Design a binder for this molecule. Structure first.
Ligand SMILES: [Zn+2]
Ligand SMILES: [Zn+2]
Lengths: 331, 331
């Protein structure tokens, strides 16, 4: 404290009516109960997901932000409302509305509620254009899904989007999404426990092993959700492959582990042993506090894992505050 | 002072014609150079994967085990030999043929070379039979793939098999294979770095979260390859999902981390920090030295990682030999 939570999500107060004007049965809208405190995300006229009032409603969130030790919270879209599968124009039309909706959300208090914007990533131009229009309008950066939906980061198109954002000092949060294991992982929220970490790790490696970091300006500010999934733990596995296989080493001139200095992670790894190794790999300068609020699989006690750790005080302040102040340029 | 490597692979001297009897298209076979030093595993008339002499030649393997300081090696099928997609009776015939080759491989030196059996896992009745048969013939246990198409370890067919092995005191090594991810990970051996440790993690969580460990006798000796993939690192994320989501908790009565007392992992994580986490999670009693010999991205210097670690002499003895001697019953 100043305490920054850079990983959380919102959903806009849109009517099914307005949603249908985009798509009648594939654009998400928000159903609210009589007594406000509950509701649900809807796809068609049929329920999609039940949802906490904290997801929308900036006023209710602030009270929770006060109850948590949380001064500033960055929030961006729920992966559902991405729409990387729609027509390019309908998506870019949709993109702008959510981003304006996000600012109507951060209008309730623009000091404590910062917002990242979404792009139509299926269309490079519109994506790049939407990004600058939104960051200039007051969004602090961009949140993208981690793939789309079959050729991963590394794809020269997505590399180009990263160059655009890097050239204009646009910060990126990369979020795992649209996993991933097919017709498996049906129970116990397995996609969140197995697939999400894997997606996130895939995205990172796809940048390192393609040698994308050799072509992208160091101006690139890029953060990866959920501690970078399983990346930090499996890194030694990767270096070993790099050392014994020409194919792993062909587009990657340095040991993959060299590249940790070209990206950020959030701290959401839910375990002191694991947070320690994450910092050991990433450096205290490259780990930012994120909660994944207000999702049940997020951190309930926001900052509790960091504050309670055997990390230095120097390290704690950077993670809780220092790193996100510079990354997003917040003061 | 003895050294036991409990994770290595072999491939037998099968000719194109003998494999042709099983399947002209899908039966793997071995093509050796005239000198007898290079080799290729073939699928039908097609080149699958390049391999070298240590895979098939136990004389050449012994000298390599001599150079490496490994006293006793436990080896088992290369997963391409599984034939889980085949017609059952054909696959059962194959399994037996393969497991007889494995006895003949071990014949060169049966005190230093120990084998695990494969099974027609797609058919429970035949699988149990072949497991029993093979162990009575000299195998110290079974190696199975971690899944059968969309069947993960929580599937009743797979749980019945484990339950059989438990009752008959047959140890199991669980190996990742037939990796998820589709057309997504085609460069830099990404399926090995990303999908492989995720598969292994899914196998473990599938037993844990379905409550399968509550139904399977505590006598079951079961080990997971490559340190149980990313399991140990992402355990916190699991325990936290279990604590805040009833659908994650529904079939699993205890916190997922309590189940580390029901299984083992090999030590192949390629990083002293990762090894330390792993041991911290599993305990020095539940981690065993395995190299993934003789594949390019196994451990080239067998035992190097464990030996250069800050672990006590007591824990090193266990991982290097102690644990496997009791797990597999070796002298
Ligand atoms: Zn999230
Ligand atoms: Zn292996």
């Amino acid at each position: 404290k100043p305490r920054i939570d850079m990983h959380s999500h919102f959903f806009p107060r849109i009517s099914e009516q307005e949603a249908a004007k985009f798509d009648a049965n594939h654009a998400p809208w928000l159903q609210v109960s009589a007594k406000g405190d509950t509701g649900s995300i809807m796809m068609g006229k049929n329920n999609f997901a039940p949802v906490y009032q904290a997801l929308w409603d900036p006023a209710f969130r602030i009270e929770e932000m006060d109850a948590q030790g949380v001064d500033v919270q960055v929030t961006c879209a729920t992966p559902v409302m991405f729409g990387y599968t729609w027509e390019a124009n309908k998506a870019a039309q949709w993109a702008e509305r959510m981003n304006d909706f996000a600012l109507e959300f951060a209008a309730h208090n623009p000091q404590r509620i910062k917002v990242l914007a979404q792009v139509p990533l299926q269309d490079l131009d519109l994506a790049c254009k939407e990004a600058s229009r939104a960051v200039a309008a007051g969004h602090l950066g961009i949140q993208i899904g981690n793939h789309l939906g079959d050729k991963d980061l590394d794809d020269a198109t997505l590399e180009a989007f990263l160059t655009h954002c890097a050239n204009e000092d646009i910060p990126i949060l990369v979020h795992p999404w649209d996993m991933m294991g097919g017709q498996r992982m049906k129970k116990w929220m397995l996609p969140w426990l197995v697939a999400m970490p894997a997606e996130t790790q895939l995205a990172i490696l796809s940048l390192i092993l393609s040698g994308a970091f050799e072509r992208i300006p160091k101006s690139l500010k890029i953060c990866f959700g959920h501690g970078g999934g399983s990346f930090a733990f499996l890194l030694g596995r990767v270096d070993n492959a790099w050392r014994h296989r020409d194919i792993v080493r062909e587009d990657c001139p340095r040991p993959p582990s060299e590249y940790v200095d070209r990206f950020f992670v959030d701290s959401a790894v839910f375990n002191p042993g694991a947070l320690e190794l994450l910092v050991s790999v990433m450096g205290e300068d490259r780990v930012m506090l994120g909660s994944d609020y207000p999702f049940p699989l997020g951190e309930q006690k926001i900052g509790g894992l960091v504050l309670s750790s055997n990390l230095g005080e120097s390290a704690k302040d950077k993670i809780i505050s220092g790193n996100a102040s510079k990354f997003f340029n917040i003061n």
